[PDB]
Design an enzyme around this catalytic site. Structure first.
Site, PDB file in Angstrom:
ATOM      1  CG  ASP A  12      -2.205  -0.866   0.892  1.00 14.17           C
ATOM      2  OD1 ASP A  12      -2.471  -1.172  -0.284  1.00 14.17           O
ATOM      3  OD2 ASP A  12      -2.923  -1.303   1.810  1.00 14.17           O
ATOM      4  N   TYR A  67     -10.356  -0.202  -0.080  1.00 15.72           N
ATOM      5  CA  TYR A  67     -10.209  -0.468   1.360  1.00 15.72           C
ATOM      6  C   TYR A  67     -10.202   0.861   2.109  1.00 15.72           C
TER       7      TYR A  67
END
Ligand SMILES: *[C@@H]1O[C@H](CO)[C@@H](O[C@@H]2O[C@H](CO)[C@@H](O)[C@H](O)[C@H]2NC(C)=O)[C@H](O)[C@H]1NC(C)=O
Ligand SMILES: *[C@@H]1O[C@H](CO)[C@@H](O[C@@H]2O[C@H](CO)[C@@H](O)[C@H](O)[C@H]2NC(C)=O)[C@H](O)[C@H]1NC(C)=O
Ligand code: NAG
Ligand code: NAG
Ligand code: NAG
Ligand code: NAG
Ligand code: NAG
Ligand code: NAG
Ligand code: NAG
Ligand code: NAG
Ligand code: CA
Ligand code: CA
Ligand code: CA
Ligand code: CA
Ligand code: CU
Ligand code: CU
Lengths: 735, 735
Positions: free
Chosen positions: A358, A438
């Site tokens: 990420d 997310y």
């Protein structure tokens, strides 16, 4: 009727020192960008391609630790102010990204530009094109290439025939990371298509149509589609698949019902009845007498109930904390989230090739917090900034700070005609990073005794997978007509540079075990009992440390020389909460050396300025030779009386079920750990707070007495304020 | 200036059915007591001794499950109303306690008295005197016996000489449990002395002076001191120790400094400076539009956001929950704490012989909650009752119910020009049991989606031990001049009778593992990936279940027949939180068969009315043949399509340190588990709440829209109310 509660204004303070870790000012970025433009032939990103040079990033290169401490503790000089920049160079025979140090700042005649690589374990400032960052340029090229292949007359027909909607109604995209083979030099990638939606729910309608392509080299005319994969069969060309589809024996799997997608909608259904009493507002936290934490707005320094710390912000990771002190002593030099990965297991070539980094996408380049909801109405909000691809981004409502009243007291006792209870107010620092599907909710919670809890909760849309009954069952549950809740791990790494009673420390564990013993007062009688034994962790351990079975141990970072009054080393206990898990997979083709910190619950290393970070934004595609290979830090060095750093992981083994549709919930997707004093003082140090009660009862008189230490609980009037909703606007920062 | 927030009154409702589990009414107790008095020769407890007959306990004998369910679900008859009573009978040749069923009630000509034993696995209604309850009569006998021995001229001299204060300034007491030997019939017990304090801090000043006596039989004149133990040496008489002390070589260990005990004081030190801004009141939860949960005061039935349940109260264990439903379906028939143990490991004969059963002392016969501190000011309070030794006790503020606003949202997502966030209000039921030195804080937290969290936090004074540098180190840290933080385990057992989608269920686990596989779409290429495999727990397993290493599993109770729309059995996931630990010790001489549930994290059994409870208040001293031996439940019965009960444990391995003086804190002494829907519905079920926001932005106009679903966040005024402090009076109930 009652008088109004006694109002007080927010308090601002002056930090003891300047924030030497803070992000670059707009003017600093401008000077650096200008200097890059005059030194190199720089093209604007919007006009660039693989053969241009262009600037990606410009940010603060943080000071080294010793110089930082000299400045903070010994009235030393301000450390040099430097920038880390990352520039793509395509003008040459081979393209590469290069990290460059620009400094000192402000730009002067003393300023130089040099290759920057000290924090890269691979010793290189240059990241080769093949393993390059998936930046705006490469993303556009891949998108154009996919369109070129998927939008032909033949492929339009194939896609519509298999999926049930025309190409215009779906979106095709590629798996991350890419797959470069150093042996042959080839770079391949897999991909899939999802139905387009108007509510960001594409991840809930994956089509089960897959492909594999060769994207080796900077000349896109040489890129080629290698395979189409459907119903577990492989086709080497569009034509071969088209022909197969004309045969009577061809099997087309059930298609998504794109006319009934209400099950993907998050917000309230207007036909849904209200539950009894839900037509009343839920409870609200208020501050009857105003705010009880203070800050220096220019230096992003915070103070609350004898805690102090500075914050810092980066594009890669979001928030970091420096120089965390309690009662005037530093306990943590640096506390910083380093990386978050999401590693999927699947029957299909899209999810099975998904291993996101990420920080490669950026955790600190996302959206503002929604007042009142993402944080209580009593929060204060802070602006941060980043720079990417020619633009400086101002991000308001980037993180929030608030005092909670926890719903349980910190401690209590009733006995001997009294009751003593101490409340549990906590300082909380939160930010939320929504990265595509997310939503990651990060919280740092500080308590009155000197304990700090670090936690994360996750939510949002899962990356589901197409459900094929023949093969999908070992990797997920069927959670909708043609949908699998693909199995994945989330793992996060935190750099926790505890400095307990100085930098020189030891790490130890109290091991708990059952043992058979005989006692001098009962000769001959064997008892099965339990004992503790302190073990010093003498050297770096390649295997890292996994939390003991049945919780049978306590892990400490101790001062090497400082003790409390009873001879115990001053220490902090690293106490795991939920989510004390690490990767299940050991040997991934999608992450061979790029995320090696994720294989155990925690690691202890000797502090080094060159071991700044356990991952980098440039790691994800560099499968075998990433800028940082975490394992390089583990080289058997003594930890016995040394500056130690704990790299602590939190994680989730997420197997989505009905309780994840339309979205995962934060309540049950939670991980945390605490840092709590352990013989750090001679006693528990919340005792001086006024937020407590001492009730006594007089046995003779039958008279009660209440001592509230200056807190007047009498009914009083207050305004319950509307949150600053007007300050929230959609988007990833103001450019 | 702002208008006042819109107030609403508390809502009361009528329960759908009567509370068939509720404690006996005072009149019911009176009728039973009167019948006992007319049937047997009963002496009043204040005039009783070991040769009298007297009543101890009178409480509801709860209905059996099938009859309860017939009443609740099929409009059947009320189950018979019965009392369980426990009476000591000393009129015979041997003394014993006997459990007797008295019913039906109200008392009539139909009423009988019969021996009661069906829930005792040992098949007995009678508990022999030697393993009897440590009741008022026996405690009194032991106290007299100790004074008679320890207050002789010689022992007064010995005590003062070793301890440094005269007998009047200390208190001597016995270890629990007692030690009965079935082979010889002998019953012995160890003990120690602690310095008297005015603040109930005796446990922080243990003297290191120990003794052992034989208390076999009902004739106290035959009881005898066997040993005095000091500095790990054993003396068989007062005289022998007295003589040794006169010798020049006699070692007297360091004595407690009784003049400097400020370190044992919990409440604020009045001379401590205030921390910055602690002269402002800490935050408060308020209900701007009033209370959002409802109840039936007469039936102790509660309703909140589609959940319903009844509560019940017992002297042994405190609160229990019955018939917990969510959205009109029962998910748990019975949820009840069963036992709490505290098992110490030590070098010394007092602590090493400490293995408390807290239900033997009573968890439900303690003190009121302190308003505003023990529960938020918005809580509602409930009165409960018990009966012991001729007295009916009315306990106000016994438990509380409140809605919290958790400080993180339930879920959220930002994408596609919208942000959707759902708040996380929870229903909370709390009681606090202060049992001597320890304070146990029990919380039951209900969430909007159908998840329930069961937790405990502990605080209070630790049972420390005298620090002997020669022998104490394997069993505790030195935490004050002559004080050790004695190592112990706290373990709690909960009966969790989940009935998911009916009584007929299965238990399963999804096992997670890494595996090497090859895929049809890449022949010959091995991948190390991860999979899940569902395994049905077919039969009761004597070993129980321990949570999987690295968290690699999900444990489910599934409906045997009901599925959601995607073919998955409706289920609830039993999710461990912190404190998922069991006993370290395996074979304790102080609990050989009395606490057999505490050795694994969880057990699954087939529901039986005769397997009502996993411990009893009568278990602790019956070391080898307790009324309930939990292992009797584990007899390899099929669980595959049966009514299952999960016995779930929570625990702490407590090694006190400085952060436990003067008291342990609730924040870091925490254990919990959750019961969360898992394919129980087709989707996540919080979506109908109004406590959510839907924000949209339009990219053309640049206009934002906020949808708050009927919740007006405009600033409004309210009164911040003073808690009902006047309802709190010290004491263990009104007699
Ligand atoms: C912070 O410390 C690092 C590591 O000691 C320094 O890295 C050195 O940098 C110089 C040139 O900048 C190189 O020639 C050395 O090889 C590097 N050493 C290592 C171990 O890699 C770095 O210069 C320091 N930063 C500052 C501001 O002084
Ligand atoms: C609840 O169920 C238990 C278990 O079936 C009943 O226990 C039986 O009680 C009778 C006399 O009371 C005995 O003859 C049986 O041996 C017991 N059975 C077992 C298996 O122990 C109990 O009576 C029931 N309680 C009520 C109120 O009906
Ligand atoms: C600068 O780079 C651009 C982009 O490739 C290129 O078109 C141009 O030739 C370069 N100009 C110079 C000064 O070489
Ligand atoms: C795909 O091809 C269709 C039809 O040939 C065309 O109308 C459309 O513009 C193409 N789409 C893209 C994104 O190039
Ligand atoms: C709203 O609820 C109705 C009734 O179940 C259902 O038909 C519809 O799909 C729902 N709409 C949305 C957007 O969820
Ligand atoms: C960024 O926002 C902050 C606070 O909202 C403001 O003070 C500052 O001037 C902004 N910076 C720029 C360049 O607009
Ligand atoms: C009733 O019990 C008391 C106390 O044990 C005893 O003194 C008396 O003898 C008893 N009466 C009879 C008839 O046994
Ligand atoms: C202990 O004995 C002393 C002196 O012999 C006496 O004064 C005292 O009251 C006795 N204590 C008790 C509890 O009987
Ligand atoms: C109060 O603080 C003073 C000054 O430090 C100390 O001497 C004393 O022990 C404290 N008293 C209590 C009851 O803690
Ligand atoms: C017990 O207390 C409750 C609430 O205070 C009260 O209503 C009830 O009358 C009391 N019961 C008795 C027997 O006094
Ligand atoms: Ca350190
Ligand atoms: Ca090293
Ligand atoms: Ca059941
Ligand atoms: Ca059984
Ligand atoms: Cu996930
Ligand atoms: Cu404890």
């Amino acid at each position: 009727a009652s008088a109004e509660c006694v109002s007080n204004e927010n308090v601002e303070i002056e930090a003891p020192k300047t924030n030497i870790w803070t992000s670059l000012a707009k003017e600093e970025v401008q000077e650096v960008l200008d200097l890059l433009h005059s030194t190199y032939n720089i093209t604007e990103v919007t006009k660039a391609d693989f053969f241009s040079n262009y600037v990606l990033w410009i940010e603060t290169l943080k000071p080294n630790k010793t110089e930082a401490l000299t400045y903070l503790d010994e009235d030393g000089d301000l450390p040099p102010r430097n920038a880390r920049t990352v520039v793509y160079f395509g003008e040459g025979e081979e393209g590469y990204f290069e990290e460059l140090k620009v400094g000192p700042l402000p730009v002067s005649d003393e300023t130089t530009i040099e290759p920057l690589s000290f924090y890269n374990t691979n010793g290189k400032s240059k990241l080769p094109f093949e393993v390059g960052h998936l930046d705006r340029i490469k993303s556009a090229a891949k998108s154009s290439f996919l369109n070129k292949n998927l939008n032909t007359t033949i492929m339009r027909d194939v896609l519509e025939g298999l999926i049930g909607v025309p190409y215009e109604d779906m979106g095709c995209h590629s798996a991350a990371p890419q797959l470069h083979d150093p042996a042959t030099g080839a770079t391949v990638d897999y991909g899939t298509c999802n139905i387009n939606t108007e509510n960001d729910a594409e991840n809930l309608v994956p089509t089960g149509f897959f492909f594999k392509f060769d994207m080796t080299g900077r000349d896109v005319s040489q890129w080629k589609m290698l395979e189409y994969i459907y119903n577990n069969k492989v086709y080497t060309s569009a034509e071969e698949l088209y022909e197969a589809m004309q045969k009577d024996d061809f099997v087309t799997l059930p298609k998504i019902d794109v006319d009934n997608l209400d099950w993907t909608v998050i917000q309230r259904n207007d036909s849904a009845p209200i539950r009894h009493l839900d037509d009343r507002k839920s409870p609200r936290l208020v501050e009857p007498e105003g705010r009880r934490w203070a800050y220096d707005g220019e230096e992003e320094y915070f103070s609350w109930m004898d805690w102090g710390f500075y914050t810092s912000w980066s594009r890669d990771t979001g928030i970091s904390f420096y120089d965390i002190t309690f009662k005037g002593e530093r306990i943590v030099y640096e506390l910083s989230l380093q990386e978050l990965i999401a590693e999927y297991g699947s029957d299909d070539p899209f999810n099975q090739h998904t291993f996101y980094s990420d920080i490669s996408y950026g955790v600190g380049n996302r959206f503002s917090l929604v007042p009142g909801y993402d944080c209580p109405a009593t929060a204060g909000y802070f602006t941060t900034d980043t720079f990417e691809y020619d633009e400086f981004y101002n991000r308001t409502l980037s993180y929030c700070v608030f005092e909670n009243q926890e719903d349980y007291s910190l401690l209590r006792h009733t006995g001997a005609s009294y009751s003593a209870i101490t409340q549990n107010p906590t300082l909380n620092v939160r930010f939320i990073s929504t990265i595509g599907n997310y939503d990651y909710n990060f919280l740092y919670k500080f308590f009155l005794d000197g304990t700090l809890e670090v936690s994360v909760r996750a939510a949002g849309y899962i990356q589901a997978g197409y459900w094929n009954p023949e093969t999908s069952a070992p990797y997920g549950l069927k959670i909708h007509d043609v949908l699998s809740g693909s199995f994945h791990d989330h793992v996060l790494n935190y750099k926790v540079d505890l400095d307990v009673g100085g930098t020189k420390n030891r790490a130890s564990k109290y091991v708990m075990k059952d043992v058979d013993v005989e006692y001098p007062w009962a000769p001959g009688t064997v008892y099965n009992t339990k004992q503790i034994a302190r073990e010093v962790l003498e050297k770096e351990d390649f295997n890292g440390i996994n939390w003991p079975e049945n919780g049978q141990g306590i892990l400490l970072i101790e001062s090497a020389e400082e003790t409390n009054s009873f001879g115990n080393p001053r220490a902090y206990n690293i106490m795991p909460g939920g989510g004390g898990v690490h990767r299940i997979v050991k040997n991934s083709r999608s992450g061979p050396e790029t995320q090696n910190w994720a294989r155990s619950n925690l690691f202890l290393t000797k502090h080094k300025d060159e071991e700044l970070r356990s991952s980098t934004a440039l790691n994800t595609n560099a499968l075998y030779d990433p800028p940082v290979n975490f394992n390089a830090f583990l080289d058997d060095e003594s930890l016995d009386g040394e500056d130690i750093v704990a790299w602590v992981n939190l994680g989730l083994h997420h197997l989505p079920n009905s309780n994840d549709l339309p979205n995962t919930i934060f309540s049950t997707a939670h991980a945390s750990f605490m840092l709590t004093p352990f013989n750090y003082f001679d006693s528990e140090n919340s005792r001086d707070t006024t937020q407590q009660v001492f009730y006594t009862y007089d046995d003779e008189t039958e008279e009660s007495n209440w001592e509230f230490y200056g807190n007047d609980w009498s009914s009083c009037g207050l305004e319950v304020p509307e949150p600053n909703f007007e300050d929230y606007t959609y988007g990833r920062g103001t450019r």
